[PDB]
Amino acid sequence: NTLIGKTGIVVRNIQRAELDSIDALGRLGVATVHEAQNRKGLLSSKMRPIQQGTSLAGSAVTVLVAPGDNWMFHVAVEQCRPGDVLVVSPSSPCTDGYFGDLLATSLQARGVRALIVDAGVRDTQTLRDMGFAVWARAINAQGTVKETLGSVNLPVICGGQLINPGDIVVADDDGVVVVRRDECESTLVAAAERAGLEEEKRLRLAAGELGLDIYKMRERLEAKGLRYVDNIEDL
Amino acid sequence: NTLIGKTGIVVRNIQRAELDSIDALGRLGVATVHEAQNRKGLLSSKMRPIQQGTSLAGSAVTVLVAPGDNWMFHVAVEQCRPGDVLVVSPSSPCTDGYFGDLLATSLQARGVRALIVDAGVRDTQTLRDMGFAVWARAINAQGTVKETLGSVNLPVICGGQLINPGDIVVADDDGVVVVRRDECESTLVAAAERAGLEEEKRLRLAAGELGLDIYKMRERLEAKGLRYVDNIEDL
Amino acid sequence: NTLIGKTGIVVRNIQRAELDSIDALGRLGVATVHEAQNRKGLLSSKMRPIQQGTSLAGSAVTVLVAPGDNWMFHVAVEQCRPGDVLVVSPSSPCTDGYFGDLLATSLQARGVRALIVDAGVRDTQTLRDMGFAVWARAINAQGTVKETLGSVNLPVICGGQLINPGDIVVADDDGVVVVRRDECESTLVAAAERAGLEEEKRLRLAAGELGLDIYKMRERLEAKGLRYVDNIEDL
Amino acid sequence: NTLIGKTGIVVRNIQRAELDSIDALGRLGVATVHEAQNRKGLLSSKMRPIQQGTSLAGSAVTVLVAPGDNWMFHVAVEQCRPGDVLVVSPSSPCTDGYFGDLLATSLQARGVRALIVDAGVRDTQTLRDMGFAVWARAINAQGTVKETLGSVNLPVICGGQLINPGDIVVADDDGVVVVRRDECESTLVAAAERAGLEEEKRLRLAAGELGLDIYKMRERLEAKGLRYVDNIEDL
Amino acid sequence: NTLIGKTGIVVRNIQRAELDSIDALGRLGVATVHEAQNRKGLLSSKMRPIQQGTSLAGSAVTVLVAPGDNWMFHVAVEQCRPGDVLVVSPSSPCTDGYFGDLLATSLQARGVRALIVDAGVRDTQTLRDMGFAVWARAINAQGTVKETLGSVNLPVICGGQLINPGDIVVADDDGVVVVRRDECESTLVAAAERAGLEEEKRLRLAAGELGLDIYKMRERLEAKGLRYVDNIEDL
Amino acid sequence: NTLIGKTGIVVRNIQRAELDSIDALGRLGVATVHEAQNRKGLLSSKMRPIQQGTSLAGSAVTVLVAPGDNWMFHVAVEQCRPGDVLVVSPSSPCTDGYFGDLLATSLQARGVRALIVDAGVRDTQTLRDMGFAVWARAINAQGTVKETLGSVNLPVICGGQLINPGDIVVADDDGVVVVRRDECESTLVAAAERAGLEEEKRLRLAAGELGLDIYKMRERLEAKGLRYVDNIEDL
Ligand SMILES: [Mg+2]
Ligand SMILES: [Mg+2]
Ligand SMILES: [Mg+2]
Ligand SMILES: [Mg+2]
Ligand SMILES: [Mg+2]
Ligand SMILES: [Mg+2]
């Protein structure tokens, strides 16, 4: 896997998954997508949105930044296209404010959909006012420098998950999940299948049908040894 | 206290406190109720609401779930009545997503007012959209299984407090407090007494009367040895 | 520095910075102000707002409180004037609910703009409803007592920063920064200079000019050894 | 369960489990005992020993202390007998130094075997020098007061587990587990059964027999769909 | 990078780095090795040794385990050879006790040098008594199950670093660093070069030569603007 | 208080407290010293020793270092004299490895007694082997740079306490406390007074006299309303 942690390199061309597929994954959401690919790819639950009610997806443009150093953000902007999501990880843990409204302005100018950053962000009310969506480990006004080289479009570890450039990142109020570029098709189909099933179940549950009956659980619960008593005094 | 931690049991009948009393406690709020019962019963401050501005109370239907296992949620739904609050604790610490919008749909169909869960929840924007109130230790899309039996309506430890089935749980933006079923009356009266006093004080404070004068503090402060100086250079 | 940690003292007269200067710092915000004074004065990123979208500043009226003891809040109210911000630190770490809506009512009656507290707060929905802005380490309904003396208008350590009475505290969604009273002028000018520059840059970035070109970064990046490759297979 | 959180009460007489049974549980250790009672009773993994290599058990003498208040420690000492373990929890979370070498001296004079405290301890090198074993949430020299009443020999929540007076607490380098007084016999027998089995297995494993063969796992692994490949390039 | 997170697979044959090289890296230690490869490869500082004074290295045999499930440990033992270090990560965060003295006995029988586990361990005093070295995220007696398949000798993320099977893991009291199998030679040479330089410097420093003079820092410090004053009153 | 956070300055001459007084404070220990000065000056309980059984004190030589930058350590060494303790804080939170065995060698050559660092340290087994005592926030092999100027012998905030150069820092297994240089005499006398009293009490407690009788607590406990019952069934 070789190129992880390597600095001083910008890879220009990456293979992206396709806009329509990406858009659909965003609408299905993180929980459904995660489940659809057999519960893999979920980033640390410490990666949190700075806004409420936004669910989206995009193709990962990856960035490795030195600790306390945001030099590679401007380098990465040039490599972004509409539909991309910038995915940034520091080379060692850091919660400084790597990113704010100026970089967000530049990203929006390129049609970038969001930032996922395994570090801190600032100018957060301005980011919300601009409608630029961010998932971050911290909110921190502490600034960074521009001294040490990192990389753009090499694989990175972000929130405990490997992210390859061009992988699809899906992000919503619950968290962030990565979908492998080559698995995008299978994951989308599986997630939609799950979504269809859940909608039928939701209607049945809303009508007052019990899940125990819907999912046919009662016999298996009894076989495991579930016992009902009328009153706690019976025990 | 015996039955804590016991699995494979569902107690059907629990004695509930009464709807009007429960409703009043919800309106008075967590801080006032906690103070009214001599500062006992408060759950861990890590139990946080996923929404803002909701204050409520209900009769606890308790659930013990195995770690990473939400099997007992559907079992518990059947035992819930309008006005109940589902109170769930894992048998060992876990922040996986035990609960989302499908289970919330089922609970709302029974008139359940909220979930208090000493673990993770997901589908959180959908939960907010549905207006289903939740207090949780974590937001986490990571799913659970249905393999190991737990219990319903046995006592549980949730957020560091013992919760008996039928105890009253009061929850708001500040946190969650448990009121013992047999102490509901005394706590309600004490909380209302506090509320009446605080409203008079609030009016006096808003008018610009100082608490030092209102609460008659000045003489006791002087006796403890509080000393005023005009300028810091005097010291 | 002597008087830090000393109890039983209230200093009545403090030299304040000036309202217009304070107001301007509030509008410029924490990140800009922090950067303007060479990245000093930022309080712990664990000091968080209980509301969204409020940015302000005021002259610090400082309070040292004993652990689990809010006695000095009422003592401090009397020493506050319009434009002040109450800045409170416990003498040892504590996240109990030191402050709620009654004290907030009293502070608003004096024209106090906010509370910064290195501990817990409660009645938080009421605080939001009143529009009383708070930055706190915790939300916690657990009450306090009034037994042990602290101090008012002596220097305190709050969020890892020394705060002298009359220093300017600037607070927004990103955090809280302290500006030394005697450095208020230089910091304001520097922050406004930064703000002017950033607004021009923002317009250029929004137009689609790259920061690499704007900030003249490309030659220095090449000199550090940044290398572009077309495809990841080239490596 | 009623009496939890109640203050101002000392229960003099408690039913204890028996010394020999208690001693055996200590020798078997926390992991084995926990497993023997179907993985219940384990206190928070944040409860840690201040020493290395000590494993023991005793009958719980329980103490509820007010936050930052160790008044009840001296009250509790009088109620202790040889073989007891003092189990202390604050009425709300606190990591102050509740306990040090003087109280330890008094406990040792009564033949008390250890302290389990859901808070802080100090004088820790002296405690080690005396050979007084302690499990604590924190090491903290910050002192406490003696102003507010708590209780002795009422049930408490300690490390997230209910502890009744006279329950058996087993503590070692891995943590602390509570064994219900009335379940002491069954747990001891089950723990010894486990210990016997594990010793035979250990000898087989040391000889180089694989667990896959010992525990007869291979057929079930294949049935679940475990697939072997020679080289990673095969995938 | 594809195979990360995949379950149900055991890769039998992995290319290992060489024993002598591995042994030398262990003697040089984590800090020196980390620095030698330009400060990459360091695992989370939360990965801590359960013993003091042991420094070692080995070839990684990687294991992905389901959360709360240690089934793959016994599967992995069979694939281990003398000199290997078992490197284990759960498919989602978990601090349960995955590993204790029985598995350690089996690993020692195969000549395995250590375990690195991004989760919990138990039987820790027995592990120390056996001299089986472990780096873990937690000490936790809470047991696991054997229900869900994982993988052996596929790449894993452990402590925030990608570990490929056959990579070299170096572990000591300061932490754990991964050295890429194909970079073993360059890293060893660089680490030894650093070690030689540091030993000469250490001798000079012990003799009382100042680093400012040794490393020729004084002129560069002055050029950056470092200013000496005799007394603090001069400022 | 002005000079806090200022960079680019080295103050050469500081007034030190006196060796014998400092040595005595070290022998009395942190808890006793902290109590003697009315429970002030204690650093964060997160500042922990990397060794066991060492208690000491020294005159603070203070260092402000930039984040991830240890340049000022070598600058500070030159300003140290026998008996000094180096006290280091980063200008913003950082847990990188600022310090290891080379710097420790240089400090020992000057007769420096210890390091207190509000950040990370490495080479920790070597530090123990050398007998160089350290209190740190973290153990972390991640290296630092030498690019940004800090200060030496200006006041710093370390572990949440203001430390002036020449203040006395006392450090042991329980933590670290700062004693103001001008209060050294009063604190030493008060700490020795406490120590004398505690030794008499210890002898009485060891003999089996109860603290309730020794400290004359029984009447005050009864007056507060402490009630004894024989059996828990009485309630
Ligand atoms: Mg900005
Ligand atoms: Mg769902
Ligand atoms: Mg209130
Ligand atoms: Mg003591
Ligand atoms: Mg075991
Ligand atoms: Mg070193």
**Token pair for residue B38?**
């001599």
Residue found by looking up tokens 């919503």 in the block: A172
Q: How far apart are CA B6 and CA E35, in angstroms?
A: 52
**Token pair for residue B87?**
């109170």
Q: Assess D34–E contact: CB distance below 8 Å, yes or no.
A: yes
Q: Which of E92, E95, E147 sits opposite B142 (nearest CB)?
A: E92
Q: How far apart are CA E35 and CA B48, in angstroms?
A: 42
**Token pair for residue A72?**
């590679």
Instruction: Answer yes or no: is D122 a known binding residue.
Output: yes
- How distant is the Cα of D65 from the closest Cα of chain C, in angstroms? 14
What b/e readout covers F108-117, taking b as 16+ CB neighbours within 10 angstroms? bbbebbbbbb
Q: How far apart are CA A3 and CA E40, in angstroms?
A: 11
Type of residue found at F194: R
What b/e readout covers B102-123, taking b as 16+ CB neighbours within 10 angstroms? bbbbbbbbbebbbbbbbbbbbb
Q: How far apart are CA C12 and CA A16, in angstroms?
A: 66
Q: How far apart are CA A85 and CA A95, in angstroms?
A: 20
Q: After which residues is chain C broken (C to N over 2.5 A)?
A: none
- How distant is the Cα of C183 from the closest Cα of chain F, in angstroms? 9
Residue A75 sits at φ, ψ, to 5 deg, of -60, -40
- Which listed ligand is nearest to E141 at the C-alpha? 5
For chain E, the straight-line distance linking the first and the last C-alpha, in angstroms and rounded, comes to 58
By DSSP bridging, strand A56-65 and strand A168-172 are: antiparallel
**Token pair for residue A172?**
């919503």
Of E40, E2, E27, the closest CA to residue E161 belongs to: E40
Residues F162, C4: C-beta atoms closer than 8 Å: yes
Residues A149/C226, Cβ–Cβ less than 8 Å: yes
Of F211, F232, F227, the closest CA to residue D78 belongs to: F211
Of E144, A24, A192, A174, the closest CA to residue B143 belongs to: A174
Q: Is B206 exposed, middle or buried (0-12, 13-18, 19+ CB in 10 A)?
A: middle
Nearest CA in chain E to A41: E5
Q: Assess B7–A contact: CB distance below 8 Å, yes or no.
A: no
Residue F107 sits at φ, ψ, to 5 deg, of -65, -45
Type of residue found at A5: G
Q: Assess E205–F contact: CB distance below 8 Å, yes or no.
A: yes
Residues C39/C31, Cβ–Cβ less than 8 Å: no
Q: How far apart are CA A188 and CA A114, in angstroms?
A: 20
Residues F142, A96: C-beta atoms closer than 8 Å: no
Type of residue found at A70: N
Of E87, E77, E82, E56, the closest CA to residue E165 belongs to: E87
**Token pair for residue C172?**
């927004």
Residue E26: strand, helix, or coil: helix
**Token pair for residue D121?**
């301890």
Type of residue found at B182: D
Residue C7 sits at φ, ψ, to 5 deg, of -120, 160
Type of residue found at E235: L
Instruction: Answer yes or no: is E122 a known binding residue.
Output: yes
Ligand 3 centroid to Cα of residue C126, in Å, is 9
**Token pair for residue B119?**
């673990």
What b/e readout covers B65-93, taking b as 16+ CB neighbours within 10 angstroms? bbbbbbbbbbbbbbbbeebbbbbbbbbbb
Check which CATH number belongs to the domain holding E105 and give it.
Answer: 3.50.30.40
- The sign of the CA dihedral C157, C158, C163, C165 is negative
Q: How far apart are CA E113 and CA E101, in angstroms?
A: 14
Residue C80: strand, helix, or coil: coil
**Strand pairing partners for F1?**
none
Residue B143 sits at φ, ψ, to 5 deg, of -75, 175
Type of residue found at F50: I
Method: X-ray
Residue found by looking up tokens 């979930």 in the block: B115
Residue B196: strand, helix, or coil: helix
For B202, C9, C171, F43, the CA distances from C164, given in Å and listed in that order, are 30, 15, 16, 20
Residues F8/F91, Cβ–Cβ less than 8 Å: no
Q: Mention every residue, 6+ apart, whose C-beta is less than 8 A from residue D161.
A: B157, D41, D42, D43, D178
**Token pair for residue C177?**
């920064």
Of E28, E80, E52, the closest CA to residue E187 belongs to: E28
**Token pair for residue C61?**
């009226």
Full DSSP string of E116-135:
EEEEEE--HHHHHHHT-EEE
Of B74, B80, B71, B70, the closest CA to residue B14 belongs to: B80
Q: Which long-range contacts (CB under 8 A, 24 or more apart) does D25-28 make?
A: D25/D57, D25/D168, D25/D170, D25/D179, D25/D184, D25/D187, D25/D188, D25/D191, D26/D55, D26/D56, D26/D57, D26/D58, D26/D170, D26/D172, D27/D55, D28/D170, D28/D188, D28/D191, D28/D192, D28/D195
Selected residue of D65, D96, D122 to mutate for chain F interface (largest F Cβ count, 10 A): D122
Helix, strand, coil % over all residues of chain C, rounded to 5: 35, 25, 40
Q: Mention every residue, 6+ apart, whose C-beta is less than 8 A from residue B18.
A: B184
Nearest CA in chain F to E30: F141
**Token pair for residue D50?**
């201040």
Count of CA atoms in the C-beta half-sphere (13 A) of E44 = 20
Query: F100 to chain E: which residues are within 8 Å by CB?
Result: 31
Residue D151: strand, helix, or coil: strand
Selected residue of B35, B232, B235 to mutate for chain C interface (largest C Cβ count, 10 A): B232
Where do runs of H (alpha helix) occur along chain E? 19-28, 30-36, 71-77, 101-109, 124-130, 184-207, 211-214, 218-224
How crowded is residue D46: how many other Cβ atoms within 10 Å of its Cβ?
A: 14
Domain of E163 in residue numbering reads as 29-180
Helix (H) or strand (E) segment spanning residue A94: none
Alpha-carbon D98 to chain mean position: 18
Residues F73/F98, Cβ–Cβ less than 8 Å: yes
Residues B85/B167, Cβ–Cβ less than 8 Å: no
Write the Ramachandran bin of E192: left for phi over 0, alpha for psi from -120 to 50, otherwise beta. alpha
| Contact: chain E with chain C (3+ CB pairs below 8 Å) | no
Type of residue found at B19: L
Full DSSP string of B29-88:
-HHHHHHHTTS--B--TT-EESSSS--EEEEEEEEEE-TTB-HHHHHHHTT--TTEEEEE
Query: C166 to chain F: which residues are within 8 Å by CB?
Result: none
Residues C92, D92: C-beta atoms closer than 8 Å: no
Residues F136/F121, Cβ–Cβ less than 8 Å: yes
Helix axes B101-109, A184-207, angle to 10 degrees: 10
**Strand pairing partners for A88?**
A63, A117
Residues B98/B74, Cβ–Cβ less than 8 Å: no
For A163, B137, B144, F7, the CA distances from B140, given in Å and listed in that order, are 19, 10, 11, 43
Alpha-carbon B60 to chain mean position: 10
- How distant is the Cα of A14 from the closest Cα of chain E, in angstroms? 14
Q: Assess C15–F contact: CB distance below 8 Å, yes or no.
A: no
Instruction: Answer yes or no: is E174 a known binding residue.
Output: no
What b/e readout covers C107-135, taking b as 16+ CB neighbours within 10 angstroms? bbbbebbbbbbbbbbbbbbbbbeeebbbb
Residues F173/C19, Cβ–Cβ less than 8 Å: no
Helix (H) or strand (E) segment spanning residue B8: none
Query: A97 to chain C: which residues are within 8 Å by CB?
Result: 31, 174
Full DSSP string of A148-187:
S--EESS-EEETTEEE-TT-EEEEETTEEEEE-GGGHHHH
Q: Mention every residue, 6+ apart, whose C-beta is less than 8 A from residue E69.
A: E90, E144, E145, E146, E147, E148, E150
Query: E173 to chain F: which residues are within 8 Å by CB?
Result: 124-125, 139
Q: Is D160 exposed, middle or buried (0-12, 13-18, 19+ CB in 10 A)?
A: buried
**Strand pairing partners for D134?**
D115
Q: Angle CA(B184)–CA(B188)–CA(B191) in degrees, nearest 5? A: 135
Q: Angle CA(C233)–CA(A41)–CA(E96) in degrees, nearest 5? A: 130
* Residues with a beta carbon under 5 angstroms from ion ligand 2: B 100, 123
**Token pair for residue B63?**
């659930």
Instruction: Answer yes or no: is A122 a known binding residue.
Output: yes
Residues F97/F120, Cβ–Cβ less than 8 Å: yes
Q: Assess A5–E contact: CB distance below 8 Å, yes or no.
A: yes
Query: F225 to chain D: which residues are within 8 Å by CB?
Result: 8, 149
Nearest CA in chain A to B165: A232
- How distant is the Cα of A170 from the closest Cα of chain E, in angstroms? 17
This PDB structure is determined at a resolution in Å of: 1.8
Q: How far apart are CA C94 and CA F33, in angstroms?
A: 22
Within A24-163, strands assigned E span 48-49, 56-65, 84-90, 114-121, 133-139, 151-152, 156-158, 161-163
**Strand pairing partners for C169?**
C58, C178
Residue found by looking up tokens 């420096």 in the block: F112
All partners of chain A with 3 or more CB pairs under 8 angstroms: B, C, E, F
How crowded is residue A129: how many other Cβ atoms within 10 Å of its Cβ?
A: 11
Type of residue found at C16: R
Query: C46 to chain B: which residues are within 8 Å by CB?
Result: none
**Token pair for residue F210?**
């109860």
Residues A160, E160: C-beta atoms closer than 8 Å: yes
Residue B190 sits at φ, ψ, to 5 deg, of -60, -40
Q: Angle CA(C55)–CA(C59)–CA(C60) in degrees, nearest 5? A: 100
Helices (H) and strands (E) in chain B, counts: 8, 12
All partners of chain B with 3 or more CB pairs under 8 angstroms: A, C, D, E
Residues A14/A61, Cβ–Cβ less than 8 Å: yes
Q: How far apart are CA D196 and CA D202, in angstroms?
A: 10
Residues B17/B169, Cβ–Cβ less than 8 Å: no
Q: How far apart are CA F84 and CA F86, in angstroms?
A: 6
Q: Which long-range contacts (CB under 8 A, 24 or more apart) does D81-84 make?
A: D81/D16, D81/D110, D81/D111, D82/D110, D82/D111, D82/D112, D83/D16, D83/D19, D83/D22, D83/D58, D83/D59, D83/D111, D83/D113, D84/D16, D84/D58, D84/D59, D84/D60, D84/D110, D84/D111, D84/D112, D84/D113
Helix axes F184-207, F19-28, angle to 10 degrees: 30
Residues C56/C172, Cβ–Cβ less than 8 Å: yes
Type of residue found at D231: N
Instruction: Tally the residues of chain A.
Output: 235
Q: Angle CA(C24)–CA(C25)–CA(C31) in degrees, nearest 5? A: 140
Type of residue found at C50: I
Q: Is C94 exposed, middle or buried (0-12, 13-18, 19+ CB in 10 A)?
A: buried
Q: How far apart are CA C137 and CA C47, in angstroms?
A: 5
Alpha-carbon F177 to chain mean position: 4
**Strand pairing partners for B63?**
B88, B152
Count of CA atoms in the C-beta half-sphere (13 A) of C167 = 24
Q: Assess E68–D contact: CB distance below 8 Å, yes or no.
A: no
- How distant is the Cα of E100 from the closest Cα of chain A, in angstroms? 25
Q: How far apart are CA D175 and CA F94, in angstroms?
A: 30
| Contact: chain F with chain D (3+ CB pairs below 8 Å) | yes
Q: Mention every residue, 6+ apart, whose C-beta is less than 8 A from residue B76.
A: B61, B63, B86, B88, B152
Helix (H) or strand (E) segment spanning residue F61: strand F56-65
Q: What distance separates the 2 farthest-apart alpha carbons in chain C?
A: 72
